[PDB]
Structures are given as C-alpha cells and as structure tokens.
Nucleic acid binder design. Structure first.
Ligand SMILES: [Mg+2]
Ligand SMILES: [Mg+2]
Lengths: 296, 296
DNA sequence: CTGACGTG
DNA sequence: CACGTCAG
DNA sequence: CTGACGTG
DNA sequence: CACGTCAG
C-alpha cells in the first residue's frame, strides 16, 4: 500500500559509457562521481577533441539536464571530470566525455592550469603502474566564520541552476601489475575551484580517504580488501606535478602532434622563445620525427 | 575492468520501516525524501511519544549518521518528516519516526506551528479520502542577490555538519476509494524553514509538481499516471489549515491530559479565556474530569 | 593539454 | 549555432 | 500536536 | 542519560 504509486526516484544509478562511468546529481545538474580506468594504450591514438561538441547527455531526463546555455556567458568554464585527453584511443569515448553529465562549472585558470596538471600526472602514472583508476567529482564545502558558524555557499548558474562547486576531488588508485606482490597505491586530493599557481605541491591538497568520504557522502572502491597492503601514493610515487618550464614544454609537444601551417609553427616558437627553455632530449627526439613527416 | 573494485556508493537506496520509507542523504545527514501512507486507522491508537527518544538510525552507517549532539544547543529543533502523530496505531512505527534518519534541522516555531498544521491537515484528509500518501523532505534553494547572481547558502550544524534546509516540501496524493473512478487529487507545497503565522493560506505555498521535481531533483510517485485526469487537491478539497482558535483549542485539549498539577491545568484554562477563546463542551468535560482528579 | 571568444 | 582564432 | 530543557 | 517539566 505504501508503495502503491512507487517510491520517489533519485536518479543516482551508475551510468556506463565507453571508457568512464558516472553517477549524476539531478538537483545540482552535475556528476556526483566519475570513475575511469587508464592505461598507456588508452591515452594513445588519433581521436581529436576539435571534432567534439559539448551537449546534453541524451540519457539524462531533460528536466534534470544542464544545457550549454547554462554555461556560456556565465563566467565559468565547462570542466570535464573524465578528460578528453584520457580517451585518445576512441573517438566515441572522447565524444562521450563532452556530454554535460561529465561536466561541472570550473574556474578557467584552474581548468587549464592546476587541474590540467593533475590530469597529466594521472596519465604519467601509467608509465609506472599497469592499471590506474581515478574517481573525480565536485564538492560544495562549508566555510567556518569567526563566530564558529559553518556555512555552505555556492553559486548556481543558468536557467537550470547548475551548481558551481567550491572544490574538486580526485581519488587515485594504482596497481603496479596484475601479478605484483606489491601494495596498491592510493591518494585522495581536494583542490579549490579557483586559480592555483605553480608554487603549491599536490601533497598540500591531500586528504585521508576517510575524510573525503565524510565530506562527499560517498564510499570509494567499496570492494577493496581492508587488510590488503595499500600505501600512500605520494610515498611510493612522486606526486610531483609539472613545473612551469616542463608544463610549457609539454604543451608545445602536444602542439607539435598537430600541424596546420608554417606561420602557426612560427608563432609557437615565438611565444616559446620569449620564455627561454632549452629543448630537452625528449622534445627534440620527438621534434625531428615529426618535422621529417611534415616536410615529406 | 573499470569496476575492478566496485563503483562508488552513494547510499540512496530506499529504506523501509513499519509505516514509512525514506532515502537518506549521506553528505547532508538528512533524508532526501520520506514517504508515508495515512488512513483513518493509522492515526488512531495508544502510541505515546513520551515513550520515544530521538536516536541515530541503527541501520545508517555511523560514519554518515547524525547524532543528537549535532542538534542539542544548535538553535535548531529536530523536525520529523514522517510525524509521530501519524503513527498512533503502532508504538514500533512511532519509535522509528524518532530515528534521526527521519529528522532535519527545523525552525522551532515552524515545526510546532505552521508545519504542524500542515501535518494536521494531512490527517484531516483521511476523513474525506480512504487513502492519503505524502512525501516530505528538505530543500536548499538559491536566493537571487542584488547583482543578479543566484547563491545557495545554508548552515551545517554539529561536528557532523548536518545541513539546515532553507525550505521544506510536502507532496500529498489522495485517493477517494480503492474502487472509485474519481480522479486522484494531488498537491505540492514548499514552505520556508522559518516562523510562519496564521495569515498565509496553505495555497500561497503551493507549487506545480513539475516545479518541485525540478527544484528537488526527484521524481515523485513515478507509477502515478499523470496523463489521466488528476485534480488539484486545493480545488477538490479545502487546503484550509486550522485557524488560530481551532489550533489553540486543540493544543489546549491535548495539554489537559498531560497536566501534572492543578496549577498547570488551571493556567491552561486561564490562557484560553485570556485570549477570548471559548472552550467547547467536550473540552470542558475533559477539563473538569482532569481537574477533579488532580485536586483529589 | 585545457578551454572560450569573435566572425560568418 | 559552426568554425577558425586566441589564450592559460 | 510539535518540541526543548531542568534535575536524581 | 532517563525522567519529569515547560513552551509554541
Ligand atoms: Mg578540464
Ligand atoms: Mg515536526
């Protein structure tokens, strides 16, 4: 009798795509969590975000979907939780990361800077671990005022009132190999949704997993054996993001992956040379292999 | 192998009790929705809330539970979504309504005044409809600031950061009889979590079901056929709360039975007459009986 | 790599 | 809106 | 009815 | 804390 006309629906079921899964927040119009698994093969290939378009997820009821009109002109950028750069292997997978079900309102500088560098480090880990799992998502955390009152405040944007998070979180779980007798590596990080420089190290944003679960109301990787050997990812690995020089270099390399015209190449080396940087052996070895191909 | 260690858990599964069900919000430490079914029989009985105590729900993971320490001294009252008064028929059901999984931080005046009167009206509906279903819960809505920005802002209380809602909602669905071909009657209401006098009629807080679903991120009564004719409950019924005199007389009537001394009983009568409220014959019967017993 | 912005 | 251009 | 508080 | 007392 109680359930004669059904229980209310919260819409939090896991939604699976080609190379990520998420749970959606219908009230805030953003994901609660986005889970991915990266390996060196996934991050290679010819998929190109220039052929992709942000758009509502066709599997989300339109009443609870965000739309591009919510974001454009808002002063907030569209920030993908599963990044396009993790899906070079499949045009379909990359396009599915442009569904707004994967997007939160993100500070432009953060999206293009510190958070970008965290994503780059997650990819770097596949050079050292066979398997890497990442859960990313938004948070709206309280601030404590001087009188002890704790208050959650956040902006909502657009006709659809899309929630702008105060912070973003990432949980990284890395397994060296399938046969490894070695412990798993785990780290949880919470970063404010704002411009962050190159000075603060990633460890300054590290939190215990239990604290993140309390803050987010989520349980991550719930099948994990609690007596298994898990260590702090920042003690068995570096947790070292790219510095300015290496970040500018990396970006330039990503740009030599692409080739459109000569004068473009000119502008590239122009801005790069205004900041010195001696091309290290890697960017050179990757410079000739492409230069030859292009003049061919 | 993306799900190697399981998907993250959000904890929103429906939880069923003797005479209500709820979905719990582990981040805010309050229910998202509480569903109940009321009839003539369930609101009769000897269940007494003086035998009950607010306590954590033993089925909620302690990590995500509220505790009484979060509420005591906070300035906010414990506000039940499924009310004790709907569970006079069963001491077990009543006890379960005092689990903190059914509780939100509620303005004291609102809890004991306007919201109390809405609850009373839900019970009144069982005099004219055989079956009444009600979904109740908290809401944290934005305000539009002077500069046009829309901001959500709410307090979180206690060491567990229990979220204080800005508003409370109720959806009421009423069915005349199980075999009747009369359309069902439905209403949705959104009330601010603050003191509300006797002046505003309940219809001033009515909203369309669609608007409440968009604001709450929920779909209510998903098995209700919305394409068949459904009546506005404030059209087919009264949506009239008890007015000051009726409310005060009802409260005084219930206070008669609790009075422990002649002083307190007599002061109940004095307050009534001081406000120019006339007692009714039933009230004077109970009052004279109790007064005789306490004097003796 | 991460995106928005201005012209059609 | 598309799409080239620009920017961190 | 709805609740918070003060004492063995 | 459990209980009795008090207030909206
Ligand atoms: Mg991004
Ligand atoms: Mg109440």
């Amino acid at each position: 009798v109680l359930e004669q006309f059904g229980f209310p629906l919260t819409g939090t079921e896991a939604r699976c795509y080609t190379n990520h899964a998420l749970s959606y927040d219908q009230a805030k119009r953003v994901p609660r969590w986005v889970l991915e698994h990266i390996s060196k093969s996934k991050i290679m290939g010819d998929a190109d975000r220039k052929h992709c378009k942000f758009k509502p997820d066709p599997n989300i009821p339109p009443t609870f979907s965000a739309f591009n009109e919510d974001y454009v002109g808002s002063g907030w950028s569209r920030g993908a939780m599963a990044p396009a750069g993790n899906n070079k292997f499949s045009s379909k997978a990359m396009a599915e990361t442009f569904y707004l079900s994967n997007i939160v309102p993100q500070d432009f500088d953060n999206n293009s800077g510190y958070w970008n560098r965290i994503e780059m480090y997650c990819r770097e880990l596949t050079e050292r671990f066979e398997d890497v799992w990442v859960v990313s998502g938004p948070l709206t955390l309280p601030q404590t005022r001087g009188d002890g009152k704790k208050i959650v405040s956040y902006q909502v944007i657009g006709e659809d009132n899309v929630a702008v998070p105060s912070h973003l979180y990432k949980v990284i779980l890395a397994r060296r190999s399938s046969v490894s007798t070695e412990p798993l590596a785990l780290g949880a990080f919470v970063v404010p949704n704002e411009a962050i420089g190159f000075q603060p190290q990633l460890t300054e944003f590290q939190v215990s997993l239990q604290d993140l679960e309390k803050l987010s109301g989520l349980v991550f990787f719930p099948h994990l054996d609690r007596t298994s050997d898990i260590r702090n990812i920042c003690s068995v690995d570096t947790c070292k993001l790219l510095d300015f020089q290496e970040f500018t270099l990396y970006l330039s390399t990503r740009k030599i992956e692409g080739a459109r015209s000569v004068l473009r190449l000119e502008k590239i080396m122009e801005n790069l040379k205004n900041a010195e940087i001696e091309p290290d052996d890697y960017f050179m070895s990757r410079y000739e292999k492409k230069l030859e191909e292009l003049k061919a």
